[PDB]
Design a protein around this ligand. Structure first.
Ligand SMILES: Nc1ncnc2c1ncn2[C@@H]1O[C@H](COP(=O)(O)OP(=O)(O)OP(O)(O)=S)[C@@H](O)[C@H]1O
Ligand SMILES: Nc1ncnc2c1ncn2[C@@H]1O[C@H](COP(=O)(O)OP(=O)(O)OP(O)(O)=S)[C@@H](O)[C@H]1O
Ligand SMILES: *[C@@H]1O[C@H](CO)[C@@H](O[C@@H]2O[C@H](CO)[C@@H](O)[C@H](O)[C@H]2NC(C)=O)[C@H](O)[C@H]1NC(C)=O
Ligand SMILES: *[C@@H]1O[C@H](CO)[C@@H](O[C@@H]2O[C@H](CO)[C@@H](O)[C@H](O)[C@H]2NC(C)=O)[C@H](O)[C@H]1NC(C)=O
Lengths: 250, 250
Protein backbone atom coordinates (compact mmCIF):
# COMPACT_ATOMS: atom_id res chain seq x y z
CA UNK A 1 0.00 0.00 0.00
CA UNK A 2 1.29 3.43 -1.02
CA UNK A 3 -0.11 5.43 1.93
CA UNK A 4 0.19 5.77 5.73
CA UNK A 5 -0.60 2.78 7.88
CA UNK A 6 -3.35 3.06 10.47
CA UNK A 7 -2.72 5.54 13.28
CA UNK A 8 -1.29 4.04 16.47
CA UNK A 9 -3.74 3.95 19.37
CA UNK A 10 -6.55 4.84 16.95
CA UNK A 11 -9.30 3.83 19.38
CA UNK A 12 -8.02 5.93 22.29
CA UNK A 13 -7.46 8.98 20.14
CA UNK A 14 -10.89 8.55 18.57
CA UNK A 15 -12.74 8.16 21.88
CA UNK A 16 -10.78 11.04 23.36
CA UNK A 17 -11.55 13.47 20.58
CA UNK A 18 -15.16 12.34 20.75
CA UNK A 19 -15.25 12.93 24.52
CA UNK A 20 -13.74 16.41 24.41
CA UNK A 21 -15.92 17.39 21.48
CA UNK A 22 -19.13 16.55 23.35
CA UNK A 23 -18.38 19.52 25.59
CA UNK A 24 -18.57 21.83 22.57
CA UNK A 25 -22.09 20.57 21.86
CA UNK A 26 -25.38 22.07 23.02
CA UNK A 27 -27.00 20.11 25.88
CA UNK A 28 -30.01 19.37 23.65
CA UNK A 29 -27.60 17.62 21.28
CA UNK A 30 -25.01 16.75 23.93
CA UNK A 31 -26.18 13.17 24.37
CA UNK A 32 -23.80 11.28 22.09
CA UNK A 33 -22.51 7.76 22.71
CA UNK A 34 -18.82 7.83 21.86
CA UNK A 35 -18.48 4.10 22.33
CA UNK A 36 -21.38 3.34 19.97
CA UNK A 37 -20.02 5.87 17.47
CA UNK A 38 -16.61 4.18 17.57
CA UNK A 39 -18.34 0.84 17.23
CA UNK A 40 -20.12 1.94 14.02
CA UNK A 41 -16.96 3.53 12.65
CA UNK A 42 -15.11 0.30 13.40
CA UNK A 43 -17.15 -1.60 10.80
CA UNK A 44 -14.85 -0.42 7.99
CA UNK A 45 -11.87 -1.89 9.85
CA UNK A 46 -13.48 -5.31 9.51
CA UNK A 47 -13.78 -5.25 5.73
CA UNK A 48 -11.33 -5.78 2.91
CA UNK A 49 -9.16 -2.61 2.83
CA UNK A 50 -10.24 -2.18 -0.79
CA UNK A 51 -13.92 -2.94 -0.30
CA UNK A 52 -15.23 -0.12 1.88
CA UNK A 53 -18.01 2.06 0.48
CA UNK A 54 -19.07 5.54 1.69
CA UNK A 55 -22.45 4.15 2.78
CA UNK A 56 -20.71 1.68 5.12
CA UNK A 57 -20.44 4.64 7.49
CA UNK A 58 -24.12 5.57 7.29
CA UNK A 59 -24.74 4.26 10.79
CA UNK A 60 -21.65 6.06 12.06
CA UNK A 61 -22.99 9.33 10.63
CA UNK A 62 -26.45 8.66 12.03
CA UNK A 63 -24.99 8.30 15.53
CA UNK A 64 -22.73 11.36 15.38
CA UNK A 65 -24.63 13.72 13.11
CA UNK A 66 -25.47 17.15 14.58
CA UNK A 67 -26.43 20.53 13.18
CA UNK A 68 -24.04 23.18 11.89
CA UNK A 69 -24.71 26.86 12.72
CA UNK A 70 -25.90 29.00 9.81
CA UNK A 71 -23.05 31.02 8.22
CA UNK A 72 -20.44 28.88 10.01
CA UNK A 73 -19.46 26.40 7.32
CA UNK A 74 -15.92 26.68 6.01
CA UNK A 75 -14.98 24.49 3.05
CA UNK A 76 -11.45 24.30 1.71
CA UNK A 77 -8.77 22.77 -0.45
CA UNK A 78 -5.04 22.65 0.21
CA UNK A 79 -5.30 24.62 3.45
CA UNK A 80 -5.89 22.02 6.15
CA UNK A 81 -3.69 23.40 8.96
CA UNK A 82 -4.56 27.05 8.29
CA UNK A 83 -8.28 26.17 8.32
CA UNK A 84 -8.01 24.38 11.66
CA UNK A 85 -5.95 27.20 13.18
CA UNK A 86 -8.22 29.89 11.88
CA UNK A 87 -11.38 27.98 12.81
CA UNK A 88 -9.88 27.80 16.29
CA UNK A 89 -11.94 24.83 17.58
CA UNK A 90 -15.34 26.19 16.36
CA UNK A 91 -14.74 29.63 17.95
CA UNK A 92 -14.56 31.47 14.63
CA UNK A 93 -15.95 28.94 12.13
CA UNK A 94 -16.97 25.32 12.00
CA UNK A 95 -15.20 23.41 9.23
CA UNK A 96 -15.77 19.66 8.77
CA UNK A 97 -12.85 18.96 11.12
CA UNK A 98 -14.70 20.84 13.86
CA UNK A 99 -17.94 18.90 13.46
CA UNK A 100 -18.21 15.74 15.58
CA UNK A 101 -17.91 13.22 12.76
CA UNK A 102 -14.98 15.04 11.20
CA UNK A 103 -13.22 15.77 14.49
CA UNK A 104 -12.75 12.13 15.50
CA UNK A 105 -10.85 11.20 12.35
CA UNK A 106 -9.06 14.40 11.35
CA UNK A 107 -5.48 13.59 10.26
CA UNK A 108 -5.81 9.93 11.20
CA UNK A 109 -5.47 6.84 8.97
CA UNK A 110 -6.95 3.38 9.20
CA UNK A 111 -7.44 0.15 7.27
CA UNK A 112 -7.53 -3.58 7.96
CA UNK A 113 -4.80 -5.87 6.61
CA UNK A 114 -5.40 -7.40 3.17
CA UNK A 115 -5.81 -11.03 4.28
CA UNK A 116 -6.09 -10.81 8.07
CA UNK A 117 -8.39 -9.47 10.78
CA UNK A 118 -5.67 -7.25 12.22
CA UNK A 119 -5.14 -3.59 11.37
CA UNK A 120 -2.33 -2.74 8.97
CA UNK A 121 0.11 -0.33 10.65
CA UNK A 122 2.52 -0.60 7.73
CA UNK A 123 0.52 1.15 5.02
CA UNK A 124 -3.00 1.74 3.71
CA UNK A 125 -4.41 1.83 0.15
CA UNK A 126 -4.37 5.14 -1.69
CA UNK A 127 -6.98 6.05 -4.29
CA UNK A 128 -4.56 4.72 -6.91
CA UNK A 129 -4.15 1.32 -5.23
CA UNK A 130 -7.93 0.97 -5.21
CA UNK A 131 -10.86 3.40 -5.21
CA UNK A 132 -12.95 2.04 -2.34
CA UNK A 133 -10.50 2.30 0.56
CA UNK A 134 -11.53 3.11 4.19
CA UNK A 135 -10.14 6.65 4.49
CA UNK A 136 -11.39 7.97 1.16
CA UNK A 137 -14.84 6.42 1.52
CA UNK A 138 -14.96 7.91 5.00
CA UNK A 139 -14.26 11.44 3.81
CA UNK A 140 -16.56 11.19 0.79
CA UNK A 141 -19.38 10.19 3.14
CA UNK A 142 -18.50 12.83 5.72
CA UNK A 143 -18.09 15.57 3.09
CA UNK A 144 -21.53 14.86 1.66
CA UNK A 145 -23.21 15.15 5.05
CA UNK A 146 -21.31 18.34 5.85
CA UNK A 147 -22.39 19.89 2.54
CA UNK A 148 -26.02 18.85 2.97
CA UNK A 149 -26.27 20.30 6.46
CA UNK A 150 -24.57 23.63 5.63
CA UNK A 151 -26.67 26.81 5.35
CA UNK A 152 -26.42 30.57 4.96
CA UNK A 153 -23.17 32.22 3.92
CA UNK A 154 -20.87 29.47 2.66
CA UNK A 155 -17.15 30.15 3.09
CA UNK A 156 -14.33 28.42 1.21
CA UNK A 157 -10.60 28.77 1.71
CA UNK A 158 -8.36 27.97 -1.26
CA UNK A 159 -4.61 28.04 -1.75
CA UNK A 160 -3.39 30.57 -4.30
CA UNK A 161 0.18 29.29 -3.86
CA UNK A 162 -0.64 25.73 -4.93
CA UNK A 163 1.28 24.84 -8.16
CA UNK A 164 -1.77 23.09 -9.62
CA UNK A 165 -4.04 26.09 -9.17
CA UNK A 166 -6.38 27.09 -6.37
CA UNK A 167 -9.27 24.84 -7.47
CA UNK A 168 -8.78 21.11 -8.23
CA UNK A 169 -11.51 19.98 -10.66
CA UNK A 170 -11.35 16.49 -9.18
CA UNK A 171 -11.16 17.32 -5.48
CA UNK A 172 -13.59 16.58 -2.65
CA UNK A 173 -14.96 20.12 -2.82
CA UNK A 174 -15.67 19.79 -6.54
CA UNK A 175 -16.90 16.18 -6.56
CA UNK A 176 -18.64 15.70 -3.23
CA UNK A 177 -19.51 19.05 -1.75
CA UNK A 178 -20.50 21.52 -4.45
CA UNK A 179 -23.08 18.97 -5.74
CA UNK A 180 -24.49 18.39 -2.27
CA UNK A 181 -25.06 22.01 -1.37
CA UNK A 182 -28.76 22.69 -0.75
CA UNK A 183 -29.05 25.84 -2.90
CA UNK A 184 -32.42 26.52 -1.27
CA UNK A 185 -30.83 27.30 2.11
CA UNK A 186 -27.67 29.01 0.89
CA UNK A 187 -27.59 32.80 0.69
CA UNK A 188 -24.22 33.18 -1.08
CA UNK A 189 -20.80 31.58 -1.52
CA UNK A 190 -17.65 33.51 -0.59
CA UNK A 191 -14.20 32.27 -1.62
CA UNK A 192 -10.97 33.30 0.15
CA UNK A 193 -7.89 32.76 -2.02
CA UNK A 194 -4.90 32.79 0.31
CA UNK A 195 -1.22 33.18 -0.62
CA UNK A 196 1.89 32.34 1.38
CA UNK A 197 3.69 35.32 2.97
CA UNK A 198 6.05 36.46 0.24
CA UNK A 199 5.05 33.05 -1.14
CA UNK A 200 4.21 32.54 -4.86
CA UNK A 201 1.05 33.99 -6.36
CA UNK A 202 0.22 31.13 -8.71
CA UNK A 203 -3.44 32.14 -8.94
CA UNK A 204 -5.62 34.93 -7.62
CA UNK A 205 -9.35 35.54 -7.83
CA UNK A 206 -10.59 35.25 -11.40
CA UNK A 207 -7.50 33.52 -12.79
CA UNK A 208 -7.01 29.99 -14.12
CA UNK A 209 -8.89 27.33 -12.17
CA UNK A 210 -10.64 30.08 -10.20
CA UNK A 211 -12.49 30.97 -13.41
CA UNK A 212 -13.59 27.37 -13.75
CA UNK A 213 -14.87 27.33 -10.16
CA UNK A 214 -16.59 30.67 -10.36
CA UNK A 215 -18.29 29.72 -13.61
CA UNK A 216 -19.68 26.47 -12.18
CA UNK A 217 -21.00 28.27 -9.12
CA UNK A 218 -22.69 31.06 -11.07
CA UNK A 219 -24.00 28.53 -13.59
CA UNK A 220 -25.58 26.60 -10.72
CA UNK A 221 -27.20 29.89 -9.77
CA UNK A 222 -25.27 30.91 -6.62
CA UNK A 223 -24.62 34.47 -5.51
CA UNK A 224 -20.80 34.48 -5.63
CA UNK A 225 -17.82 36.54 -4.35
CA UNK A 226 -14.04 36.20 -4.09
CA UNK A 227 -11.46 37.80 -1.80
CA UNK A 228 -7.69 37.55 -2.20
CA UNK A 229 -5.89 37.13 1.11
CA UNK A 230 -8.89 37.62 3.39
CA UNK A 231 -7.53 39.82 6.16
CA UNK A 232 -8.29 37.91 9.37
CA UNK A 233 -6.59 34.84 7.85
CA UNK A 234 -3.73 36.92 6.45
CA UNK A 235 -3.21 38.27 9.97
CA UNK A 236 -3.00 34.68 11.23
CA UNK A 237 -0.46 33.66 8.57
CA UNK A 238 1.51 36.73 9.60
CA UNK A 239 1.92 35.49 13.19
CA UNK A 240 4.90 33.49 11.90
CA UNK A 241 6.35 36.23 9.72
CA UNK A 242 6.10 39.31 11.93
CA UNK A 243 9.11 41.05 10.36
CA UNK A 244 8.12 40.48 6.73
CA UNK A 245 6.88 43.65 4.94
CA UNK A 246 3.53 42.08 4.01
CA UNK A 247 2.93 41.80 7.73
CA UNK A 248 4.16 45.22 8.88
CA UNK A 249 1.51 47.16 10.82
CA UNK A 250 0.75 50.88 10.73
CA UNK B 1 -17.06 23.09 47.40
CA UNK B 2 -17.29 26.17 45.17
CA UNK B 3 -15.16 24.98 42.24
CA UNK B 4 -16.34 23.13 39.14
CA UNK B 5 -17.01 19.41 39.57
CA UNK B 6 -14.77 16.87 37.86
CA UNK B 7 -14.82 16.86 34.07
CA UNK B 8 -17.12 14.28 32.51
CA UNK B 9 -15.30 11.34 30.90
CA UNK B 10 -12.07 12.42 32.57
CA UNK B 11 -10.43 9.09 31.78
CA UNK B 12 -11.31 9.01 28.09
CA UNK B 13 -10.15 12.61 27.65
CA UNK B 14 -6.94 12.02 29.62
CA UNK B 15 -6.08 8.86 27.69
CA UNK B 16 -6.88 10.48 24.35
CA UNK B 17 -4.82 13.58 24.98
CA UNK B 18 -1.98 11.39 26.22
CA UNK B 19 -2.23 9.16 23.18
CA UNK B 20 -2.23 12.09 20.76
CA UNK B 21 0.68 13.79 22.49
CA UNK B 22 2.86 10.71 22.08
CA UNK B 23 3.24 11.57 18.39
CA UNK B 24 4.58 15.02 19.31
CA UNK B 25 7.35 13.33 21.32
CA UNK B 26 10.91 12.64 20.19
CA UNK B 27 11.42 8.99 19.10
CA UNK B 28 13.73 8.57 22.11
CA UNK B 29 11.17 9.77 24.68
CA UNK B 30 8.14 8.35 22.85
CA UNK B 31 8.07 5.39 25.27
CA UNK B 32 5.13 6.53 27.39
CA UNK B 33 2.53 4.28 28.93
CA UNK B 34 -0.67 6.32 29.02
CA UNK B 35 -2.65 3.81 31.08
CA UNK B 36 0.21 3.65 33.56
CA UNK B 37 0.37 7.42 33.65
CA UNK B 38 -3.38 7.58 34.22
CA UNK B 39 -3.12 5.01 37.00
CA UNK B 40 -0.39 7.05 38.75
CA UNK B 41 -2.55 10.15 38.38
CA UNK B 42 -5.44 8.22 39.92
CA UNK B 43 -3.37 7.64 43.08
CA UNK B 44 -3.76 11.28 44.01
CA UNK B 45 -7.32 11.15 42.72
CA UNK B 46 -8.56 8.59 45.22
CA UNK B 47 -7.45 10.45 48.37
CA UNK B 48 -9.56 12.85 50.46
CA UNK B 49 -10.49 15.88 48.28
CA UNK B 50 -8.68 18.11 50.80
CA UNK B 51 -5.74 15.85 51.63
CA UNK B 52 -3.97 15.88 48.27
CA UNK B 53 -0.44 17.27 48.26
CA UNK B 54 1.80 18.21 45.34
CA UNK B 55 4.04 15.33 46.38
CA UNK B 56 1.16 12.93 45.70
CA UNK B 57 1.69 13.44 41.97
CA UNK B 58 5.38 12.53 42.01
CA UNK B 59 4.78 9.14 40.39
CA UNK B 60 2.61 10.69 37.69
CA UNK B 61 5.30 13.28 36.97
CA UNK B 62 8.01 10.63 37.02
CA UNK B 63 6.11 8.56 34.44
CA UNK B 64 5.29 11.46 32.14
CA UNK B 65 8.30 13.74 32.48
CA UNK B 66 10.18 14.58 29.28
CA UNK B 67 12.63 17.30 28.26
CA UNK B 68 11.70 20.81 27.13
CA UNK B 69 13.63 22.29 24.16
CA UNK B 70 16.08 24.98 25.23
CA UNK B 71 14.70 28.48 24.60
CA UNK B 72 11.19 27.15 24.01
CA UNK B 73 9.67 27.57 27.49
CA UNK B 74 6.75 30.00 27.82
CA UNK B 75 5.45 30.95 31.26
CA UNK B 76 2.38 33.13 31.74
CA UNK B 77 -0.41 34.66 33.85
CA UNK B 78 -3.94 35.73 32.88
CA UNK B 79 -3.55 34.71 29.23
CA UNK B 80 -4.20 30.96 29.14
CA UNK B 81 -6.14 30.83 25.85
CA UNK B 82 -3.89 33.28 24.05
CA UNK B 83 -0.84 31.31 25.20
CA UNK B 84 -2.35 28.01 24.08
CA UNK B 85 -3.13 29.55 20.66
CA UNK B 86 0.16 31.27 20.08
CA UNK B 87 2.12 28.19 21.14
CA UNK B 88 0.01 26.44 18.55
CA UNK B 89 0.69 22.97 19.97
CA UNK B 90 4.49 22.97 20.51
CA UNK B 91 5.05 24.47 17.03
CA UNK B 92 6.17 27.96 18.09
CA UNK B 93 6.81 27.57 21.87
CA UNK B 94 6.19 24.87 24.45
CA UNK B 95 4.07 26.16 27.38
CA UNK B 96 3.20 23.86 30.29
CA UNK B 97 -0.01 22.87 28.50
CA UNK B 98 2.09 21.62 25.59
CA UNK B 99 4.17 19.24 27.70
CA UNK B 100 2.74 15.76 28.31
CA UNK B 101 1.80 16.10 31.98
CA UNK B 102 0.21 19.50 31.45
CA UNK B 103 -1.57 18.55 28.25
CA UNK B 104 -3.51 15.73 29.91
CA UNK B 105 -5.03 18.04 32.53
CA UNK B 106 -5.25 21.39 30.72
CA UNK B 107 -8.63 22.99 31.51
CA UNK B 108 -10.02 19.81 33.09
CA UNK B 109 -11.16 19.45 36.69
CA UNK B 110 -11.34 16.61 39.20
CA UNK B 111 -11.78 15.44 42.79
CA UNK B 112 -13.15 12.51 44.79
CA UNK B 113 -16.32 12.80 46.85
CA UNK B 114 -15.95 14.16 50.38
CA UNK B 115 -16.96 10.72 51.67
CA UNK B 116 -17.24 8.11 48.91
CA UNK B 117 -15.03 6.30 46.41
CA UNK B 118 -16.63 8.04 43.44
CA UNK B 119 -15.50 11.19 41.66
CA UNK B 120 -17.57 14.26 42.56
CA UNK B 121 -19.17 15.55 39.34
CA UNK B 122 -21.08 18.12 41.38
CA UNK B 123 -18.32 20.38 42.65
CA UNK B 124 -14.68 20.44 43.77
CA UNK B 125 -12.95 22.42 46.52
CA UNK B 126 -11.36 25.75 45.63
CA UNK B 127 -8.30 27.24 47.28
CA UNK B 128 -10.54 28.75 49.96
CA UNK B 129 -12.66 25.65 50.61
CA UNK B 130 -9.28 24.10 51.46
CA UNK B 131 -5.65 24.34 50.36
CA UNK B 132 -4.60 20.77 49.61
CA UNK B 133 -7.21 19.99 46.95
CA UNK B 134 -6.50 17.74 43.91
CA UNK B 135 -6.34 20.42 41.19
CA UNK B 136 -4.24 23.07 42.93
CA UNK B 137 -1.68 20.55 44.21
CA UNK B 138 -1.51 19.23 40.66
CA UNK B 139 -0.55 22.50 39.00
CA UNK B 140 1.80 23.23 41.87
CA UNK B 141 3.73 19.97 41.18
CA UNK B 142 3.56 20.42 37.42
CA UNK B 143 4.65 24.08 37.53
CA UNK B 144 7.63 23.14 39.67
CA UNK B 145 8.76 20.50 37.18
CA UNK B 146 8.19 22.71 34.16
CA UNK B 147 10.33 25.38 35.80
CA UNK B 148 13.01 22.96 36.94
CA UNK B 149 13.27 21.58 33.40
CA UNK B 150 13.43 24.91 31.54
CA UNK B 151 16.63 26.33 30.02
CA UNK B 152 17.90 28.96 27.62
CA UNK B 153 15.84 32.07 26.99
CA UNK B 154 12.86 32.00 29.35
CA UNK B 155 9.75 33.73 28.01
CA UNK B 156 6.75 35.01 29.99
CA UNK B 157 3.43 36.34 28.75
CA UNK B 158 1.54 38.70 31.02
CA UNK B 159 -1.75 40.52 30.66
CA UNK B 160 -1.28 44.26 31.02
CA UNK B 161 -5.03 44.79 30.82
CA UNK B 162 -5.46 42.88 34.05
CA UNK B 163 -7.16 45.34 36.46
CA UNK B 164 -5.02 44.26 39.40
CA UNK B 165 -1.77 44.54 37.44
CA UNK B 166 0.37 42.44 35.11
CA UNK B 167 2.36 40.52 37.74
CA UNK B 168 0.36 38.75 40.49
CA UNK B 169 2.74 38.74 43.44
CA UNK B 170 0.85 35.71 44.75
CA UNK B 171 0.27 33.68 41.59
CA UNK B 172 1.76 30.36 40.41
CA UNK B 173 4.54 32.04 38.45
CA UNK B 174 5.72 34.02 41.46
CA UNK B 175 5.22 31.30 44.03
CA UNK B 176 6.11 28.10 42.22
CA UNK B 177 7.96 28.91 39.03
CA UNK B 178 10.31 31.85 39.63
CA UNK B 179 11.71 30.06 42.72
CA UNK B 180 12.41 26.91 40.70
CA UNK B 181 14.13 28.41 37.68
CA UNK B 182 17.73 27.16 37.43
CA UNK B 183 19.94 30.21 36.89
CA UNK B 184 22.94 28.11 35.78
CA UNK B 185 21.09 26.82 32.72
CA UNK B 186 19.16 29.99 31.88
CA UNK B 187 20.54 32.74 29.67
CA UNK B 188 17.95 35.48 30.17
CA UNK B 189 14.31 36.18 30.96
CA UNK B 190 12.16 38.08 28.47
CA UNK B 191 8.66 39.25 29.32
CA UNK B 192 5.85 40.13 26.92
CA UNK B 193 3.29 42.49 28.43
CA UNK B 194 0.24 42.10 26.19
CA UNK B 195 -2.68 44.54 26.13
CA UNK B 196 -6.14 43.87 24.72
CA UNK B 197 -6.71 45.43 21.31
CA UNK B 198 -8.08 48.86 22.15
CA UNK B 199 -8.44 47.41 25.65
CA UNK B 200 -6.92 49.19 28.71
CA UNK B 201 -3.22 49.74 29.29
CA UNK B 202 -3.38 49.13 33.04
CA UNK B 203 0.36 48.43 33.10
CA UNK B 204 3.24 48.36 30.63
CA UNK B 205 6.87 47.40 31.02
CA UNK B 206 8.32 49.28 33.98
CA UNK B 207 4.99 50.20 35.58
CA UNK B 208 3.23 48.94 38.70
CA UNK B 209 3.79 45.28 39.52
CA UNK B 210 6.16 45.12 36.55
CA UNK B 211 8.63 47.07 38.69
CA UNK B 212 8.34 44.40 41.37
CA UNK B 213 8.85 41.54 38.91
CA UNK B 214 11.86 43.22 37.31
CA UNK B 215 13.45 44.00 40.66
CA UNK B 216 12.91 40.45 41.93
CA UNK B 217 14.41 38.82 38.85
CA UNK B 218 17.34 41.22 38.90
CA UNK B 219 18.03 40.68 42.62
CA UNK B 220 18.13 36.96 41.79
CA UNK B 221 20.85 37.64 39.23
CA UNK B 222 18.97 37.17 35.94
CA UNK B 223 19.45 39.21 32.79
CA UNK B 224 16.07 40.81 32.14
CA UNK B 225 14.23 42.46 29.25
CA UNK B 226 10.58 43.38 28.71
CA UNK B 227 8.54 44.01 25.55
CA UNK B 228 5.11 45.60 25.24
CA UNK B 229 2.74 43.80 22.91
CA UNK B 230 5.31 41.44 21.35
CA UNK B 231 4.47 41.62 17.64
CA UNK B 232 3.90 37.94 16.81
CA UNK B 233 1.35 37.69 19.62
CA UNK B 234 -0.14 41.07 18.78
CA UNK B 235 -0.79 39.86 15.23
CA UNK B 236 -2.54 36.81 16.69
CA UNK B 237 -4.70 39.09 18.82
CA UNK B 238 -5.43 41.08 15.69
CA UNK B 239 -6.90 38.08 13.90
CA UNK B 240 -10.15 38.94 15.72
CA UNK B 241 -10.03 42.71 15.23
CA UNK B 242 -8.78 42.95 11.65
CA UNK B 243 -10.49 46.34 11.15
CA UNK B 244 -9.34 47.94 14.41
CA UNK B 245 -6.67 50.62 13.78
CA UNK B 246 -4.08 48.86 15.97
CA UNK B 247 -4.41 46.04 13.47
CA UNK B 248 -4.15 47.92 10.16
CA UNK B 249 -1.34 46.89 7.79
CA UNK B 250 0.79 48.83 5.30
N1 LIG C 1 -12.54 18.61 5.72
C1 LIG C 1 -11.63 17.65 5.72
N2 LIG C 1 -10.88 17.42 6.91
C2 LIG C 1 -9.92 16.43 6.92
N3 LIG C 1 -9.60 15.60 5.84
C3 LIG C 1 -10.38 15.87 4.65
C4 LIG C 1 -11.39 16.85 4.50
N4 LIG C 1 -11.94 16.84 3.23
C5 LIG C 1 -11.27 15.88 2.65
N5 LIG C 1 -10.30 15.23 3.43
C6 LIG C 1 -9.33 14.06 3.06
O1 LIG C 1 -8.15 14.03 3.85
C7 LIG C 1 -7.41 12.86 3.32
C8 LIG C 1 -5.95 12.99 3.76
O2 LIG C 1 -5.00 13.19 2.64
P1 LIG C 1 -3.85 14.32 2.49
O3 LIG C 1 -4.27 15.22 1.38
O4 LIG C 1 -2.51 13.64 2.41
O5 LIG C 1 -3.98 15.17 3.87
P2 LIG C 1 -4.39 16.60 4.34
O6 LIG C 1 -3.53 17.14 5.42
O7 LIG C 1 -5.86 16.49 4.54
O8 LIG C 1 -4.10 17.46 3.00
P3 LIG C 1 -5.06 18.43 2.13
O9 LIG C 1 -6.55 18.15 2.44
O10 LIG C 1 -4.83 18.12 0.65
S1 LIG C 1 -4.53 20.33 2.52
C9 LIG C 1 -7.75 12.94 1.79
O11 LIG C 1 -8.39 11.67 1.48
C10 LIG C 1 -8.60 14.18 1.75
O12 LIG C 1 -9.41 14.28 0.59
N1 LIG D 1 0.21 26.16 32.86
C1 LIG D 1 -1.02 25.96 33.28
N2 LIG D 1 -1.93 25.30 32.42
C2 LIG D 1 -3.23 25.09 32.84
N3 LIG D 1 -3.76 25.46 34.09
C3 LIG D 1 -2.80 26.12 34.94
C4 LIG D 1 -1.44 26.41 34.63
N4 LIG D 1 -0.81 27.05 35.69
C5 LIG D 1 -1.77 27.14 36.57
N5 LIG D 1 -3.01 26.60 36.21
C6 LIG D 1 -4.35 26.52 37.01
O1 LIG D 1 -5.50 26.55 36.17
C7 LIG D 1 -6.63 26.45 37.13
C8 LIG D 1 -7.90 26.95 36.40
O2 LIG D 1 -8.44 28.21 36.96
P1 LIG D 1 -8.90 29.53 36.15
O3 LIG D 1 -7.92 30.60 36.48
O4 LIG D 1 -10.36 29.78 36.40
O5 LIG D 1 -8.63 29.11 34.61
P2 LIG D 1 -7.69 29.49 33.44
O6 LIG D 1 -8.29 29.24 32.11
O7 LIG D 1 -6.40 28.84 33.81
O8 LIG D 1 -7.56 31.09 33.65
P3 LIG D 1 -6.25 32.03 33.95
O9 LIG D 1 -5.06 31.15 34.42
O10 LIG D 1 -6.61 33.01 35.06
S1 LIG D 1 -5.86 33.06 32.26
C9 LIG D 1 -6.09 27.28 38.34
O11 LIG D 1 -6.08 26.35 39.46
C10 LIG D 1 -4.75 27.73 37.81
O12 LIG D 1 -3.85 28.13 38.83
C1 LIG E 1 -0.39 26.37 0.11
O1 LIG E 1 0.31 25.70 -0.94
C2 LIG E 1 1.74 25.80 -0.80
C3 LIG E 1 2.37 25.12 -2.00
O2 LIG E 1 2.01 23.74 -2.07
C4 LIG E 1 2.17 25.15 0.52
O3 LIG E 1 3.58 25.33 0.70
C5 LIG E 1 4.39 24.25 0.41
O4 LIG E 1 4.28 23.32 1.50
C6 LIG E 1 5.07 22.12 1.30
C7 LIG E 1 4.84 21.25 2.52
O5 LIG E 1 4.87 22.02 3.72
C8 LIG E 1 6.55 22.49 1.13
O6 LIG E 1 7.31 21.33 0.81
C9 LIG E 1 6.72 23.52 0.01
O7 LIG E 1 8.07 23.94 -0.06
C10 LIG E 1 5.83 24.72 0.28
N1 LIG E 1 5.94 25.68 -0.80
C11 LIG E 1 5.89 26.98 -0.55
C12 LIG E 1 6.01 27.92 -1.74
O8 LIG E 1 5.77 27.45 0.58
C13 LIG E 1 1.43 25.81 1.69
O9 LIG E 1 1.75 25.13 2.89
C14 LIG E 1 -0.07 25.75 1.46
N2 LIG E 1 -0.76 26.45 2.52
C15 LIG E 1 -1.49 25.77 3.40
C16 LIG E 1 -2.18 26.57 4.49
O10 LIG E 1 -1.62 24.55 3.37
C1 LIG F 1 -6.63 40.06 29.86
O1 LIG F 1 -7.38 40.59 30.96
C2 LIG F 1 -8.66 41.14 30.54
C3 LIG F 1 -9.24 41.88 31.73
O2 LIG F 1 -9.20 41.10 32.92
C4 LIG F 1 -9.56 40.01 30.02
O3 LIG F 1 -10.76 40.59 29.48
C5 LIG F 1 -11.94 40.42 30.17
O4 LIG F 1 -12.48 39.14 29.80
C6 LIG F 1 -13.78 38.87 30.36
C7 LIG F 1 -14.18 37.48 29.88
O5 LIG F 1 -13.88 37.31 28.50
C8 LIG F 1 -14.79 39.93 29.90
O6 LIG F 1 -16.05 39.71 30.52
C9 LIG F 1 -14.29 41.34 30.25
O7 LIG F 1 -15.14 42.31 29.65
C10 LIG F 1 -12.88 41.55 29.73
N1 LIG F 1 -12.34 42.83 30.16
C11 LIG F 1 -11.76 43.66 29.27
C12 LIG F 1 -11.22 44.97 29.79
O8 LIG F 1 -11.67 43.40 28.07
C13 LIG F 1 -8.83 39.29 28.88
O9 LIG F 1 -9.57 38.13 28.55
C14 LIG F 1 -7.40 38.88 29.26
N2 LIG F 1 -6.70 38.43 28.08
C15 LIG F 1 -6.38 37.15 27.93
C16 LIG F 1 -5.65 36.77 26.67
O10 LIG F 1 -6.65 36.28 28.77
Amino acid sequence: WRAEGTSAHLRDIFLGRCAEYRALLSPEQRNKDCTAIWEAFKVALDKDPCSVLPSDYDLFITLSRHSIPRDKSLFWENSHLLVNSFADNTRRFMPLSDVLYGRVADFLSWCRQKADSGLDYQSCPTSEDCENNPVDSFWKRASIQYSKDSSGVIHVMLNGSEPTGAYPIKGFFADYEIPNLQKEKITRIEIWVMHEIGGPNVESCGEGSMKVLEKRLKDMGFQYSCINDYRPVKLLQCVDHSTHPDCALK
